[PDB]
């Protein structure tokens, strides 16, 4: 190497192997000396994180990753609970795929995580299979949402202040924007729709392989790639929900509440399995 | 009273009479003890200003107010150069009005102030006759733009980062917003158009007196109130420029550059009077 870990980190943790990486951070296995138990440590280079640490510290939901510690050294170190089943992405690449029952169980948890975010005024903005971690290598497991590097605290207070004028001077485009203000969170429901599409079908709804119509043009028209042969194996209920999340109008798009009330999620077997997994954890 | 001035303020300044007030701050005459010269002190109650102080300290233009000092006490105190001719508003109320020659001189300075802001990545967002101060009680004078409480540092870096995905997951409305991103500054050109309309005609373009069409509906349609009798006294050139600033499409709206190149502003007499006023100041 060309470096060492900072002394404050080394004091409390024994660092181990790489668990994963992305465009922002590399994630390492470590052992916490005090408990002798495993953690994950995300390393972020300095070349904000303040806001990501702040958001993470105040969130408390079983389907959202918890922060355990933080170092502000030559790099940033974020100590996290360890997720031993890896990424959701690993379960859906090779155009391969989950059974509908486990898509439902995993998705139900995603909806709850995201619902809880939106209730607390947070938008994730980067929901993707690589940012959904599994608890164990067992198929029926708890998932957690991770990677809050792009997330925002919800607001519109700037618009609300503008509107307390004095419109004599106010530009028309500011007044036009009032029609959709406060629907930022809907980008998360779109992302959820895409993740749900992928989990059910094994393939992405919008993609450059095939087509000729630009990826952009496919997304703004909402003309996802439907392959009947692949969807025949999936219930009508599951597809109906995908359709309601992949609506181009963000005001007409399903919210996490409307998705949780969708017929697909009225599944007592799935919900009982979720509560079962929760109680196991909490010992 | 129910209060005193903070000791740090009193140490350097002798406070005097109220010069003006708004929804945010009350502005007081003061004398700086060290120079025995007059200043204005804006008092802002604590119930941000950091960002307004920061923006003001880095701006250096003859048509923009300068900050001289700052106190962060039970209230905020912003010490400013004193403008002895008051607000532009005072010259245009009572549905009364300026001669076209002085509208031009004052407007030319406004365009320069705003051009300089946009070049430096700042949008004012609250341009109005009450935030344009005159240097003296003489008609031909220097104006300064003031009141940067609503101003923003220009950006889009969030969108630019979103676009460095990974559009597989990206919501259509984010992709739609790319078409107008980076035209925030255009709200200042709209405000300038309205101020110019008022200065030339004595009356506001959008107003609830008369009409029945809602103020909002008038602004978004761009159907300003044109009274021929009032505009007959104004050149065709002046009105043409108003028309180009009061365009509802912010991408087609005149920029401060296009306005400075408008035939109305190709006036060597006006420009010579401006440079004359500048050199007087700078002694
Ligand atoms: N708490 C964790 N437990 C186990 N693996 C993790 C954990 N957090 C992240 N990882 C692995 O590291 C990868 C990158 O983490 P993430 O926070 O998404 O970084 P980035 O901001 O670079 O995308 C993840 O996709 C995952 O594979
Ligand atoms: N530098 C100054 N010199 C003289 N008068 C001033 C000065 N600054 C402000 N004023 C007077 O005080 C009023 C309020 O100041 P401003 O900064 O616009 O406060 P607000 O944020 O409350 O609108 C102005 O409209 C003007 O009449
Ligand atoms: Cl809400
Ligand atoms: Cl530019
Ligand atoms: Mg990630
Ligand atoms: Mg994180
Ligand atoms: Mg003001
Ligand atoms: Mg100010």
HSE on the CB side for A67, CA within 13 Å?
A: 18
Whole-number Å distance between alpha carbons of B228 and B234: 10
Residue B181 with chain A: CB contacts under 8 Å:
none
Return the residue whose CA atom lies nearest to atom 23 of ligand 2. Answer: B22
Query: How far apart, in whole angstroms, are the C-alpha atoms of residue A272 and residue A280?
Result: 12
- Check if A126 is active-site: yes
> Contact B97/B29 with Cβ under 8 angstroms?
no
Rounded Cα gap, residues A71 and A5, in angstroms: 11
Our CA-based measurement puts residue B196 at a distance from the nearest CA of chain A, in whole angstroms, of: 11
Nearest to B172 among A125, A176, A220 (CB): A220
Q: Which tokens belong to A173?
A: 């485009």
Under DSSP, the state recorded for A89 is: G
Half-sphere exposure of A256 (CA within 13 A, CB side): 21
- Give me the helix-helix angle, A186-201 and A100-119, nearest 10°: 170
CA A85 to chain centre: 16
Q: What angle do CA A103, A109, A114 make, to 5 degrees?
A: 120
Contact A66, A53 (CB under 8 A): no
Which atom of ligand 2 is nearest the CA belonging to B81?
Answer: 1
Helix, strand, or coil (residue A144): strand
Pocket test for ligand 1, best of A65, A93, A147 (most atoms within 8 A of CB): A147
Asked whether the beta carbons of A83 and A95 are under 8 A apart, the reply is no
φ/ψ of B16, rounded to 5, equals -130, -150
Cβ of residue B173 closer than 8 Å to a chain A Cβ: yes
How far the first Cα of chain A sits from its last, in Å, is: 40
Angle, vertex CA A106, rays to CA A101 and CA A108, nearest 5? 95
Tokens of A229: 């042969």
What residues of chain A lie within 8 A of the CB of B187, using their CB?
A: 171, 173-174
Contact residues on chain B for A250, CB-CB shorter than 8 A? 171, 173
Q: Sign (positive/negative) of CA torsion B159, B160, B163, B164?
A: negative
Experimental method, per PDB record: X-ray
Which residue of the set A72, A90, A126, A240 is catalytic? A126
Q: How far is CA A238 from the centre of its chain?
A: 20
- Residue among A195, A204, A219 whose CB faces B172 most closely: A219
Number of H helices and E strands in chain A, helices first, is 11, 9
Q: Which domains, and CATH codes, for chain A?
A: 1-82 (3.30.200.20), 83-283 (1.10.510.10)
CB atoms under 10 Å from CB of A83, counted, come to 22
- CB of A52 closer than 6 A to ligand 1? no
Closest ligand 1 atom, residue A146 Cα: 17
Q: Tokens 């705003």 belong to which residue?
A: B114
CB A73 within 8 A of CB A6: yes
What is the rounded CA–CA span in Å between residue A165 and residue B148? 15
Token pair recorded at residue B268: 């060597």
Could you give the CA distance from residue A230 to residue A22 in angstroms, rounded to a whole number? 30
> How far is the C-alpha of B64 from the C-alpha of B50, rounded, in Å?
18
CA–CA dist B241, B236 (Å, integer): 9
Q: Please list the residues that pair with A14 across neighbouring strands.
A: A31
CA distances from B173 to A32, A118, A128, A221, B46 (A): 44, 18, 18, 11, 38
Instruction: Answer whether B246 contacts ligand 2 (Cβ < 6 A).
Output: no
Q: Where are the beta strands (DSSP E) in chain B?
A: 13-21, 25-32, 37-45, 67-72, 75-81, 122-123, 132-134, 143-145, 152-153
Tell the residue number behind the tokens 């690993």, with chain if given.
A90
Of A172, A190, A219, which has the smallest distance from its Cβ to B219's Cβ? A172
Q: Tell which atom from ligand 2 comes closest to the C-alpha of B23.
A: 22
Q: In this structure, are residues A245 and A259 in contact, taking their beta carbons and an 8 Å threshold? A: yes
Q: How many angstroms separate the alpha carbon of residue B200 from the centre of ligand 2?
A: 23
CA distances from B198 to A148, A264, B103, B215 (A): 48, 60, 10, 16
Distance between CA atoms of residues B256 and B61, nearest Å: 15
Residues 6 or more apart whose CB falls under 8 angstroms from that of A157 comprise none
Measure Cα distances from A45 to A20, A49, A149, B191, B254 in Å. 15, 11, 13, 43, 43
Q: Which residues of A touch B150 (CB under 8 A)?
A: 161-162
d(CA A39, CA A14): 10
The experimental resolution of this structure, in angstroms, equals 2.2
Burial code (b: 16+ CB inside 10 Å, e: under 16) for B117-146 equals bbeeebbbbbbbbbbbbbbeeeeebbbbbb
**Torsional class of A171: left (φ above 0), alpha (ψ -120 to 50), beta (otherwise):** beta
How buried is B168 (Cβ within 10 angstroms: 0-12 exposed, 13-18 middle, 19+ buried)?
A: middle
A174 touches chain B (CB under 8 A): yes
Instruction: Estimate to the nearest angstrom the gap between the alpha carbon of B88 and the chain centroid.
Output: 11
Asked if A207 lies within 8 A of B172 by C-beta distance, the reply is no
Burial grade of A114 (CB within 10 A; 0-12, 13-18, 19 or more):
buried
Question: What are the residues facing A123 on neighbouring strands?
Answer: A152
How many other CB atoms are there within 10 angstroms of residue B278's CB atom?
13
**Which one of B168, B175, B182 makes the best mutation probe of the A interface by having the most chain A beta carbons within 10 Å?**
B168
Tell me which of B22, B129, B169, B194 to substitute to probe the interface with A (most A C-beta atoms closer than 10 Å): B169
* B215 and B208 Cβ atoms separated by less than 8 Å: yes
| Mutation choice for A interface testing from B158, B167, B171 by most A CBs within 10 A | B171
């Amino acid at each position: 190497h060309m470096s060492v870990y900072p002394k404050a980190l080394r004091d409390e943790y024994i660092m181990s192997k790489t668990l994963g990486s992305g465009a922002c951070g590399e994630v390492k296995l470590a052992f916490e000396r005090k408990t002798c138990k495993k953690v994950a440590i995300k390393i972020i280079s300095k070349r904000n994180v303040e806001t990501e640490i702040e958001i993470l510290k105040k969130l408390n939901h079983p389907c959202i990753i918890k922060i355990k510690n933080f170092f502000d050294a030559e790099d940033y170190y974020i100590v996290l609970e360890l997720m031993e089943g890896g990424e959701l992405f690993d379960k859906v690449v090779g155009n391969k795929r989950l059974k509908e029952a486990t898509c439902k169980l995993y998705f139900y948890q995603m909806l709850l995580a995201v619902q809880y975010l939106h209730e607390n005024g947070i938008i994730h903005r980067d929901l993707k299979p690589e940012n959904v971690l599994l608890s164990s290598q067992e198929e029926d497991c708890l998932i957690k949402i991770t990677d809050f590097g792009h997330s925002k605290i919800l607001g519109e207070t700037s618009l609300m202040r503008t509107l307390c004028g004095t419109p004599t001077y106010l530009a028309p485009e500011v007044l036009v924007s009032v029609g959709t203000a406060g629907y930022n969170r809907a980008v998360d429901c779109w992302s959820l729709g895409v993740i749900l599409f992928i989990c059910l079908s094994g393939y992405p709804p919008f993609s450059e392989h095939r087509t000729q119509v630009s990826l952009k043009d496919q997304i703004t028209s909402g003309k996802y790639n439907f392959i009947p042969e692949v969807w025949a194996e999936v219930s009508e209920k599951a597809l109906d929900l995908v359709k309601k999340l992949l609506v181009v109008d963000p005001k007409a798009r399903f919210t996490t509440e409307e998705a949780l009330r969708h017929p697909w999620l009225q599944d007592e077997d799935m919900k009982r399995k979720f509560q079962d997994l929760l109680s196991e954890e909490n010992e």
